[PDB]
From Swiss-Prot, chains B, E, F:
Structural component of the short non-contractile tail. The tail comprises six spikes that mediate primary attachment to the host cell lipopolysaccharides (LPS) and display endorhamnosidase enzymatic activity, hydrolyzing the alpha-1,3-O-glycosidic linkage between rhamnose and galactose of the O-antigen polysaccharide. Digestion of the LPS brings the capsid near the cell outer membrane. It comes from Salmonella phage P22. The gene is 9. The chain holds residues 5 to 124 of 667 of the full protein. This is Tail spike protein. The interdigitation of the polypeptide chains at the C-termini is important to protrimer formation in the folding pathway and to thermostability of the mature protein. Homotrimer. Interacts with the host O-antigen lipopolysaccharides; this interaction induces cleavage of host O-antigen. Interacts with tail hub protein gp10; this interaction anchors 6 fibers onto the tail hub hexamer. It is found in: Virion. Belongs to the P22likevirus tail fiber protein family.
Curated annotation (Swiss-Prot), chains C, D, G:
Monomer; homododecamer upon binding to the portal ring. Interacts (via C-terminus) with the portal protein; this interaction participates in the head completion. Interacts with the Tail hub protein gp10. Interacts with the tail needle protein gp26. The lineage of its organism: Viruses, Duplodnaviria, Heunggongvirae, Uroviricota, Caudoviricetes. This is Head-to-tail adapter protein gp4. The N-terminus changes its conformation when transitioning from the preassembly state to the postassembly state. InterPro entries: Gp4_sf (IPR038258), Tail_accessory_Gp4 (IPR020362). Keywords: Degradation of host cell envelope components during virus entry, Degradation of host peptidoglycans during virus entry, Hydrolase, Late protein, Lyase, Viral genome ejection through host cell envelope, Viral penetration into host cytoplasm, Viral short tail ejection system, Virion, Virus entry into host cell.
UniProtKB/Swiss-Prot annotation, chain H:
Acts as a tail hub by assembling onto the head-to-tail adapter protein gp4, generating a channel that is sealed by the tail needle protein gp26. Together with gp4 and gp26, gp10 is required for stabilization of the condensed DNA within the capsid; perhaps by plugging the hole through which the DNA enters. Monomer (in solution). Hexamer; assembles as a hexamer onto the dodecamer formed by the head-to-tail adapter gp4. Interacts with the head-to-tail adapter protein gp4; each gp10 monomer contacts 2 head-to-tail adapter protein gp4. Interacts with the tail needle protein gp26. Interacts with the tail spike protein gp9; binds six tail spike trimers. It is found in: Virion. The chain holds residues 414 to 472 of 472 of the full protein. This is Tail hub protein gp10. It comes from the Viruses. It comes from Salmonella phage P22 (Bacteriophage P22). The lineage of its organism: Viruses, Duplodnaviria, Heunggongvirae, Uroviricota, Caudoviricetes.
Length: 471, 120, 152, 152, 120, 120, 152, 59, 117
């Protein structure tokens, strides 16, 4: 009899502690669609091809709707689309925001606003000549824009300041400082959800809304405690707007970290046990440096998380059986994915880089990253089939678009850790649209079996309908 | 300047008294100049997978019909520390070979002391 | 023949079973192959009843030379198919298997064809009984006084 | 004939079995080709019992030639169908298949027709016994004659 | 003191399951963890002649009936510039073996290596 | 967590054109770039014991049925103080193999040169 | 042979049954070893009915020698297969199992082949009765006054 | 145990092994269940214990 | 017939009142996960390895989110992470809290605040 083997998500044993871990598809995304006896397939991540050369590795990106263009910070320079429109100091990741008048960048504990008229200003206190208040502005950690006001967060002191309405380079005249204060500490990040300023500390998330107060000195924001979320974020870039609220990576201040999404006053975990272990493998450092972001195309609603040694992509559109995570990597040896800071502009998705001063444009026809072939993996869960004598391992592979008749290394494991010999089977060939990728004589299952099915291509890989004849 | 020789991977262990592979043979790998049959004198032995991860395995390695090491009937690539001693035993317990130091079989024995004593 | 050793015979038997071949992704660990070679030796020894059974030219391995696998079996070109089909039938029960009908039929055909020539040789007629006269028309025997057949 | 090699015979066998044909979309794997060539050699050696079996003209390879596939089989035109049908029947169980009833029937018919002419040739009548007179109606024709047939 | 040890430099190539030499088989070697049959993955191979002239040859390395590589009917020593991934195919075309990472270093011509690595 | 593939260091000498051992074969070791079958061209050879004790042995080395060198009916390791040339003859006297220079340099004299130029 | 002890016979039987074999990734429980050895002893004493049954050369373990396992069975090379196939059939019921058809057939065939040579030897013909004359053709006997056959 | 209170004879089976990733923890011959049956399955160890899929052939 | 026996929770009788009780697993945590025909496995509770040397049996723990550290009240001392920071009287479990300027411990009916300075 025939048995259909799922490939979206495999099983295995982790030999560090002999545990049961999950095997996540590498460079593969699970697209749920009824093709033929399948109800879903797997497709290679779109390849990256060179678009622009810049000053350095990317450090931040935003979509300035005021100038309806993508602003990017590569190296020490600033770009509005392609042309350079400014210079930026420092070398780490920078925060970005924008308004009607300027594009603001948070860098080196400063809010530097590049106005569209060509003037570079910096947020600072009002001159003492004014009859206006003086605030204790510290180092800027994160910035956001709302209702024609920049709101920035003081460094590690719970306080956040909003700018003045008609002078954006200075804080508000009379009431610019606010606190979370339902907490001992934490202003790790700041964002804007719908009209609420959302302040992410460690072990709390606070919501503030416009008061409408008009008198001098009255508060222009009031906390709405009915919407407080009792969980924090690990670093300043460990949160992104995912579905209608934020998705964040929780802080060690509230137990073991994992990926959550704000519901309505509560957080619902998204990471499975294996993703939780992957996160737990990092210290508080190398976790506060993680960078989350989002992407959306062909109904794929991906949430991408870059850590020093991993890139985990969670597909929200194809999580009907549970959370669906995949691993993105560059090269043949689990080197970290090079693309970063994806933004959709015009009709193309453009991405920065991590190691070279380039910007690519995410071609869908290919799967090679800057003309470099990539390794694609697809593991099958272990199962117990004592004395089964399997035959006819078939996969329905979408062929036709290729530059060479690229092959596929098929292999099998018996204990979930070490895999056997690799057999090369032609999984694709140029300009042929009927291939029948198939291996006739698989072995005999003694106690357990699992399959590996690795592909190295410069061309897209589309696999579905994996089946075996178990007799 | 090609300094890497294209040779046979997956070494072959052959009978000492006849030209036949040591089918179902045993290899014990241990510390230098000591017998590796005793578990006290053994050293870790790893297998390198495709992904590069080294997984440690049980010490008596199995030699299949071809004279090459197998794990579960599958050819593997075995690795260990630079210096080790090998004791290859037959299926019935016969001693096929005993190499006290594997490093003392490289053709160029002079290079060892040369690279150890001459300054760079 | 490409099948020249006891292990080659065992590999052919396993391939016929479908348990393991050169194309499979999983293979039998060498203790299984050693067990199969022991089964083959036992079967061949049972066939060849100390010289009074089926004559094949099979060379029984000696315990001094350690590995039985690797020893040439010494069979002719025409006995290999029969021997390894019977071996597949015999070692099928190890793997919770039952040899298929074609394999069983081929095993029967091969064993019968193996014994055919030796049966033709062994079909011999006994000499005349000791009480059988030689005949007066033989001249030589009558003159030599050899009137009766010796016998036995 | 368009089938003039052992590889062509093996390919016809697989196509009949439905394993590797363009009627389906499968291609021949080299492991299948090698195993089936070994099976064909073994089956032919079993048939042709060193001259006392089925005579077909099949040419047995030698160790000197590295690839067994690629050589002409040497069979006459009328033996190819029987050869490849029986090869398909023999190599079916390697894939846990069972050759269909049409293939089994055609293999039986082909083997019978293969041996028909050999049977007609071998149906020979042995000479007269050693103790048989040749008759008085013969000597007058051959003045020398002999009175009794020689035999053997 | 002992300086060199006698040894057979010629590598041998046998089947993975049986103690038989791969007769008239082919060897492809290319980038590590790839498919060496692809000319886009292949790397150059040089015959190191009796003096070490390093003459470059085409990729598919032919294996004798004795399990040894030859070029123009003569046994040759083949070297490459770095670690590679190797695929050995039989005479029929069946994949005898595939090793993702192979690296053994040339043991001869130490004089040049020492001359370069030491300070006079 | 390892650096050297487990291998079989003991040499085995198979025939040049066909896959079989050099049963009852001869090995001759001589001066570099000369015919070692001449006792004038011959150089000495030592059996390097397991503990490292060296004994001198007569030059024509006997190779048993397994392709391995034995002196007292036991597997041995042969060493030479200088570089050499190695000629392997089968049991019918045919020249199976010849190598004029086995490490492509002479470690004996190169030891003196290295001690005289390279810094200590 | 590689089956030279009672433990070798028991391991072969359990592997045939599929209870304890590396192809099953199990190993022999010592209690099962003891039980199988006891079954083999009882079965062998039942076959060898104190000399009037089947003769195989099996060496019964005396009481004093403490571990019966480990001793040579003493069988010839042609009895081992029959012995361990029949032992597998005998000890299958302990596990609520049932030896498969091939095992049962090989057990029957082996037992018959074991008794073949003893049956040939025991097919002896009784001497002439005490009332049968020797005839006058036996001139030596009738001259030495031996007129009737002795008998018994 | 046949009553859930007092457990019977204990049998020692290897549940783990250093660097052995295929073990098959299995007891062949359990007894005859008279009225009730329960199992204890106790491990004393210095290493992680992972157990799943307890199955048994009841005939 | 093959039958699967649940292992996450046993059953039995209490020999004092002859009442049915659940036998709970000892030192094992049940992880729900489809591995193979199982839909869940059981893993031993992770072990304990020595890390430090406090002054006595632990009397409290808290996570200070201002200093971003772990404060342990062990024995008679108070530790921020590994290094002693203060002294705590009494010999029982204590209450802990913290704020902007001080980590406060409730002990012996007194609310004693240890400021970071």
């Amino acid at each position: 009899p025939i048995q259909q083997l799922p490939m979206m998500k495999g099983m295995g044993k982790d030999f560090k502690n002999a545990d049961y871990i999950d095997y996540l598809p590498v460079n593969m995304l699970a697209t749920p669609k009824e093709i033929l006896n399948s109800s879903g397939y797997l497709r290679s991540f779109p390849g990256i091809t060179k678009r622009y050369d810049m000053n350095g590795v990317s450090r931040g990106v935003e979509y300035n709707t005021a100038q309806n263009a993508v602003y990017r910070v590569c190296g020490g320079k600033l770009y509005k689309g392609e042309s350079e429109v400014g210079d930026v100091a420092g070398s780490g990741r920078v925060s970005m925001a924008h308004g009607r008048t300027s594009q603001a960048v948070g860098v080196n504990g400063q809010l530097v606003e590049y106005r569209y008229d060509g003037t570079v200003k910096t947020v600072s206190n009002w001159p003492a000549d004014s009859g206006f208040t003086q605030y204790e502005l510290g180092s800027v950690r994160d910035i956001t824009r709302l209702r024609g006001r920049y709101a920035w967060s003081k460094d590690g002191t719970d306080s956040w300041f909003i700018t003045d309405l008609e002078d954006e380079s200075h804080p508000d005249r009379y009431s610019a400082q606010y606190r979370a204060e339902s907490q001992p500490d934490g202003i790790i990040g700041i964002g804007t959800w719908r009209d609420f300023i959302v302040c992410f500390g460690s072990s709390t998330i606070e919501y503030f809304s416009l008061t409408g107060a008009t008198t001098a000195g009255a508060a222009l924001y009031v906390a709405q405690p009915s919407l407080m979320v009792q969980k924090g974020i690990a670093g300043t870039y460990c949160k992104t707007p995912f579905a209608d609220s934020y998705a964040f990576i929780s802080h060690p201040a509230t137990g073991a970290p994992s990926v959550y999404i704000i519901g309505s006053g509560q957080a619902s975990p998204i990471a499975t046990a294996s993703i939780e272990k992957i996160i737990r493998s990092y210290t508080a450092e190398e976790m506060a440096t993680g960078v989350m972001e989002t992407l959306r195309f062909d109904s794929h609603e991906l949430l991408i998380i870059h850590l020093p040694r991993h890139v985990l992509v969670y597909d929200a559109s194809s999580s009907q059986n549970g959370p669906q995570w995949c691993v993105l990597k560059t090269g043949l040896y689990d080197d970290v994915y090079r693309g970063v800071d994806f933004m959709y502009e015009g009709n193309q998705i453009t991405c920065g880089d991590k190691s070279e001063a380039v910007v690519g444009q995410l071609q869908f026809d290919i799967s090679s990253q800057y003309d470099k072939q990539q390794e694609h993996l697809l593991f099958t869960p272990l199962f117990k089939a004592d004395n089964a004598r399997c035959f006819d391992l078939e996969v329905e592979s979408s062929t036709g678009v290729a530059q060479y008749a690229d092959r596929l290394f098929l292999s099998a494991t018996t204990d979930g850790i070490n895999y056997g010999r690799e057999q090369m089977i032609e999984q694709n060939e140029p300009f042929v649209y009927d291939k029948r990728v198939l291996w006739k004589r698989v072995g005999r299952i003694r106690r357990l079996i699992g399959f590996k099915l690795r592909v190295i291509t410069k061309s897209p890989v589309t696999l579905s309908g994996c089946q075996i004849r178990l007799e | 300047t090609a300094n890497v020789v294209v040779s046979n991977p997956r070494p072959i262990f052959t009978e000492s008294r006849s030209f036949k592979a040591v089918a179902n043979g045993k290899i014990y790998i241990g510390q230098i100049d000591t017998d590796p049959v005793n578990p006290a004198n053994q050293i870790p032995v790893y297998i390198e997978n495709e992904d590069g991860s080294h997984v440690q395995i049980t010490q008596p390695l199995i030699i299949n019909a071809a004279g090459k090491i197998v794990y579960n009937g599958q050819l593997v690539k075995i690795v260990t520390v630079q210096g080790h001693s090998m004791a290859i035993y037959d299926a019935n317990g016969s001693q096929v070979d005993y190499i006290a130091n594997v490093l003392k079989y490289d053709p160029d024995q002079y290079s060892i002391e040369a690279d150890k004593k001459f300054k760079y | 023949m490409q099948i020249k050793t006891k292990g080659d015979l065992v590999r052919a038997a396993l391939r016929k079973l479908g348990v393991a071949s050169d194309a499979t992704l999983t293979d039998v660990e060498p203790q299984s192959m050693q067990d199969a070679v022991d089964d083959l030796e036992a079967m061949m020894a049972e066939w060849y009843q100390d010289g009074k059974g089926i004559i094949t030219g099979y060379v029984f391995s000696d315990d001094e030379n350690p590995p039985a696998e690797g020893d040439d079996h010494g069979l002719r070109s025409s006995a290999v198919s029969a021997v390894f089909h019977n071996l597949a039938c015999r070692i099928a029960p190890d793997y919770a298997l039952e040899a298929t009908a074609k394999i069983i039929a081929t095993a029967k055909y091969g064993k019968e064809l193996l014994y055919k020539q030796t049966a033709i040789s062994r079909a011999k007629r006994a000499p005349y009984p000791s009480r059988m006269p030689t005949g007066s028309g033989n001249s030589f025997a009558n003159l030599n006084e050899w009137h009766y057949f010796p016998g036995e």
